[PDB]
Amino acid sequence: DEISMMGRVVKVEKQVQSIEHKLDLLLGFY
Amino acid sequence: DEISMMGRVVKVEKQVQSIEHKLDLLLGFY
Amino acid sequence: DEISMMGRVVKVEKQVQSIEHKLDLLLGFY
Amino acid sequence: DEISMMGRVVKVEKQVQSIEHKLDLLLGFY
């Protein structure tokens, strides 16, 4: 099921953005 | 093979959650 | 839509590379 | 193209494992 698949890809993308922002906090990038 | 593909996406999602939790530990978010 | 899907996968890949480079900065790998 | 797609997913998975190991280094998990 391609919608299920796309759903998981979109979820991963959002988590990945949130991860990058958290590292920007540790690094002092803003 | 779409099951193989979905399998890898699900695996990536779980690793990504585990990564976000580990950074929450470094950041002091709980 | 497979192009939309591929688009999101490529985006995730680029964010993931950028994340790995940022951690290389925290770790002192260069 | 599904092979191209699977190729990128596998690449992301490998980068994600490498990212988790790097954080294990910052956290002192071994």
UniProtKB/Swiss-Prot annotation, chains A, B, C, D:
Tissue distribution: Expressed in the outer, but not the inner, sensory hair cells of the cochlea. Slightly expressed in heart, brain and skeletal muscle.
Location(s) in or outside the cell: Basal cell membrane
Stretches of the chain forming a coiled coil according to its record: 5-26
SUBUNIT field: Homotetramer. Interacts (via C-terminus) with calmodulin; forms a heterooctameric structure (with 4:4 KCNQ1:CALM stoichiometry); the interaction is calcium-independent, constitutive, participates in the proper assembly of a functional channel. The interaction with calcium-free CALM controls channel trafficking whereas interaction with calcium-bound CALM regulates channel gating. May form a functional heteromultimeric channel with KCNQ3. Interacts with HSP90AB1; promotes cell surface expression of KCNQ4.
Disease linkage: Deafness, autosomal dominant, 2A: A form of non-syndromic sensorineural hearing loss. Sensorineural deafness results from damage to the neural receptors of the inner ear, the nerve pathways to the brain, or the area of the brain that receives sound information.
Miscellaneous notes: Mutagenesis experiments were carried out by expressing in Xenopus oocytes KCNQ4 mutants either individually (homomultimers) or in combination with wild-type KCNQ4 (mut/wt homomultimers) in a ratio of 1:1, to mimic the situation in a heterozygous DFNA2 patient.
Family recorded in the similarity comment: Belongs to the potassium channel family. KQT (TC 1.A.1.15) subfamily. Kv7.4/KCNQ4 sub-subfamily.
UniProt function note: Pore-forming subunit of the voltage-gated potassium (Kv) channel involved in the regulation of sensory cells excitability in the cochlea. KCNQ4/Kv7.4 channel is composed of 4 pore-forming subunits assembled as tetramers. Promotes the outflow of potassium ions in the repolarization phase of action potential which plays a role in regulating membrane potential of excitable cells. The channel conducts a slowly activating and deactivating current. Current often shows some inward rectification at positive potentials.
Protein's name in the database: Potassium voltage-gated channel subfamily KQT member 4
Gene behind the chain: KCNQ4
